[PDB]
Amino acid sequence: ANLAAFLTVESAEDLSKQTEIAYGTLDSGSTKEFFRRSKIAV
Amino acid sequence: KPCDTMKVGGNLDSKGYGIATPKGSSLRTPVNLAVLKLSEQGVLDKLKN
């Protein structure tokens, strides 16, 4: 039955908790500045 | 609690929580600049947490 059902029919936190995908910003941008000064722990 | 509530979907419009004063308040501008100062540190954001 379930075979049938299974045949009939990602966030900023995620970025922070990983490092595999070299995630970054403009090296010369206010975006880089947002992070350098953010008072948010994350 | 009781944690039986959840926000779903994006905002239906845009609202900004700003400090209000009687039209043309004497503190209107000083409070704007002080608000600016506290927003420059984003004290409000930590206060959110």
Swiss-Prot record, chain A:
Entry's induction text: Down-regulated in the pyramidal cell layer of CA1 in the hippocampus by global ischemia.
Domain remarks: The M4 transmembrane segment mediates tetramerization and is required for cell surface expression.
Subcellular location: Cell membrane; Postsynaptic cell membrane; Postsynaptic density membrane
UniProt-annotated site: Interaction with the cone snail toxin Con-ikot-ikot, residues: R36
Modification Phosphoserine occurs at: S38
Changes after translation: Palmitoylated. Depalmitoylated upon L-glutamate stimulation.
Similarity comment: family membership: Belongs to the glutamate-gated ion channel (TC 1.A.10.1) family. GRIA2 subfamily.
Note: The postsynaptic actions of L-glutamate are mediated by a variety of receptors that are named according to their selective agonists. This receptor binds AMPA (quisqualate) > L-glutamate > kainate.
Top-level taxonomic group: Eukaryota
Function summary: Ionotropic glutamate receptor that functions as a ligand-gated cation channel, gated by L-glutamate and glutamatergic agonists such as alpha-amino-3-hydroxy-5-methyl-4-isoxazolepropionic acid (AMPA), quisqualic acid, and kainic acid. L-glutamate acts as an excitatory neurotransmitter at many synapses in the central nervous system and plays an important role in fast excitatory synaptic transmission.
Subunit structure and binding partners: Homotetramer or heterotetramer of pore-forming glutamate receptor subunits. Tetramers may be formed by the dimerization of dimers. May interact with MPP4. Forms a ternary complex with GRIP1 and CSPG4. Interacts with ATAD1 in an ATP-dependent manner. ATAD1-catalyzed ATP hydrolysis disrupts binding to ATAD1 and to GRIP1 and leads to AMPAR complex disassembly. Interacts with GRIP2. Interacts with GRIP1. Interacts with NSF via its C-terminus. Interacts with CACNG2, PICK1 and GRIP2. Interacts with GRIA1 and SYNDIG1. Part of a complex containing GRIA2, NSF and NAPA and/or NAPB.
Residues engaged in binding L-glutamate: S30, T31
Tissue: Detected in forebrain. Detected in dendrites of neuronal cells. Expressed in the pyramidal cell layers of CA1 and CA3 and in the granule cell layer of the dentate gyrus.
Protein name: Glutamate receptor 2
